[PDB]
């Protein structure tokens, strides 16, 4: 049920995943993972009445500091889907405060920072994210993008190549690498 539900959620069918997870809810399962999953599904399946109460039950049920950080990360995703980037800013910072080695929170908080305008903060946060999780492609791509925006084509190349190493079938990474290798001649 969990596997088919995840696969249904990620292949842009969150309502079927919400059904598959409401099934586990119906069978007495009471976790932090299950309720955060129900929150993600309810929000992305466009059921705004049962969305945030599930995240509240999740935050209640979390027996860790990484589970709390993941729930705050997902609440920041909900917030940034709602707009109001300040609430998502606070949620990402709380995900960091709970789990210091949370690279997705670093990446998203750097995206919001560069949205505000603070380029150096975003650069440092993306460097931290790409240092914690090298296997991810978003921190590398964003660092390369901001570098290329300001210049520093060496750092842009060193970051876009690691992006291509992380997600080798990307598209924007390929255009970035083509532009860079063209600037080098």
């Amino acid at each position: 049920i969990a596997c088919i539900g995840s696969n249904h959620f990620y292949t842009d069918q969150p309502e079927v995943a919400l059904r598959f997870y409401r099934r586990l809810l119906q069978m007495g399962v009471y976790n932090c993972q299950l309720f955060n999953n129900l929150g993600l599904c309810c929000f992305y399946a466009q059921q705004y009445d049962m969305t945030l109460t599930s995240f509240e039950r999740a935050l209640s049920l979390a027996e860790n500091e990484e589970e709390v950080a993941d729930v705050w990360y997902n609440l920041g995703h909900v917030a940034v889907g709602t707009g109001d980037t300040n609430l998502a800013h606070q949620c990402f910072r709380l995900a960091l405060v709970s789990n210091n080695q949370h690279a997705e929170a670093y990446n998203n908080l750097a995206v919001l920072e560069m949205r505000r305008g603070h380029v150096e903060q975003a650069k440092a946060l993306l460097q931290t994210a790409s240092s914690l999780a090298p296997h991810m492609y978003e921190p590398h791509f964003n660092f390369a993008t901001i570098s290329d925006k300001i210049g520093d084509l060496q750092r842009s190349y060193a970051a876009a190549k690691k992006s291509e190493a992380a997600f080798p079938d990307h598209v924007d990474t390929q255009h970035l690498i083509k532009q860079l290798e063209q600037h080098f001649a």
Binding site: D12, Q46, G81, T82, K161
Partner: protein, 388 residues
């Protein structure tokens, strides 16, 4: 000196980068330096690889060997400019210019540096010089970028037209001039230049996107849908493409298959106000009024200085049993809208439905002062007139 000559030029051409590099450590030792090609291979070759630090060091050494050479100073300033330092790049290009006052590369690079330094007078004059010495496409592109950043397209249309005048096979120039035609009222020459681009490159994503946009604007959504089918597999996850596809499917009353594409594009870019506005609009048309408010409020929080956003937020709101919030949202909209009478007509409808009939006339007069094509905004124009 350099006895091998091409030995350390054979592994490099094939990009072996082992024998050619290891051979250097041996060729240099035998010759005790002073070869001037072993170092050169390390430099330009280093720059071809990601590294732009050893390239700068070796170009420094080449400048030290030939103090009075303009090309070495040019290469050192270029190695600087490949890093983030543009002021030092300018100050080295200056010395490279006081040894050679007849080349376009120094002026083009000074232009692109002063561009990153936001000095637009010096950049503009330097790039004019770079044109007068030897006209190149990239100088034209940088001048157009200057005239777009600083001012208006009124100054960029002339430059891009003069650029495409000669060497008209560059896709970048054609496509950028077509885009700038879209940015203005002209939709015909924009189509002309986008088709000119598409003849050369049929699968040009940056041109297919704008062509499909223009097509969607004048109805005929199936043609734009085919244009997008042309490039769907090349860029399978790109928010703009899926937003345009969702608007295609929303044009021909496929509201569910449009919500699908729009939500997929929103998932891949949660900070893009256009997809949020489109989701709000479609959920208004689908009469859901609970999601519409959510997405329109998000798009407001992302671009607050818009008039239609607050109109649609008020519009849905009116159906969410909250009329005071609709009042204040309509006030925000009418204050922040200048050239769209739909906001005024909808606020007049809200007022007249509230039993006032007094300020509804004020909104009707505001609309009639603002003004003209929509079939259903015409009738409500006359029905709220005659009934008031």
């Amino acid at each position: 000196l350099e006895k091998q000559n091409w030995l350390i030029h054979l592994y490099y051409i094939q990009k072996d980068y082992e024998a050619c590099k290891a051979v250097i450590k041996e060729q240099l030792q035998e010759t005790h330096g002073l070869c001037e090609y072993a170092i050169y291979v390390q430099a330009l070759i280093f720059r071809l690889e990601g590294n732009i630090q050893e390239s700068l060091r070796l170009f420094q050494m080449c400048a030290f060997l030939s103090p009075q050479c303009a090309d070495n100073l040019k290469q050192v300033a270029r190695s600087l400019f490949l890093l983030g330092k543009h002021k030092a790049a300018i100050e080295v290009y200056n010395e490279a210019a006081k040894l050679n006052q007849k080349d376009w590369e120094i002026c083009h690079n000074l232009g692109v540096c002063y561009i990153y330094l936001k000095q637009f007078d010096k950049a503009q004059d330097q790039l004019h010089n770079a044109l007068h010495l030897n006209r190149h496409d990239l100088t034209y592109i940088m001048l157009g970028k200057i005239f777009l950043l600083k001012g208006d397209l009124d100054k960029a249309i002339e430059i891009y037209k003069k650029a495409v005048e000669f060497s008209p096979e560059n896709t970048e120039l054609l496509t950028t001039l077509g885009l700038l035609y879209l940015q203005l009222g002209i939709y015909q020459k924009a189509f002309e230049h986008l088709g000119n681009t598409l003849t050369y490159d049929p699968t040009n994503y940056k041109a297919i996107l704008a062509a499909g946009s223009m097509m969607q604007t004048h109805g005929d959504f199936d043609v734009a849908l085919t244009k997008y089918k042309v490039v769907a597999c090349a860029v399978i996850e790109s928010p703009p493409l899926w937003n345009n596809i969702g608007m295609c499917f929303f044009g021909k009353k496929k509201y569910v298959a449009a919500i699908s594409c729009l939500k997929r594009a929103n998932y891949l870019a949660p900070l893009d106000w256009k997809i949020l506005y489109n989701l709000g609009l479609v959920h208004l048309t689908m009469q859901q009024y609970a999601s519409a408010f959510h997405f329109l409020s998000a798009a407001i929080n992302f671009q607050p200085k818009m008039g239609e956003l607050y109109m649609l937020l008020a519009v849905a709101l009116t159906n969410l049993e909250d009329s005071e919030n609709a009042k204040r949202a309509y006030e925000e909209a009418v204050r922040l809208d200048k050239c769209n009478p739909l906001v005024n007509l909808n606020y007049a409808v809200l007022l007249y439905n509230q039993g006032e009939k007094r300020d509804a006339l004020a909104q009707y007069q505001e609309m009639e002062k603002k003004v003209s094509s929509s079939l259903e905004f015409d009738p409500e124009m006359v029905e709220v007139a005659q009934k008031l």
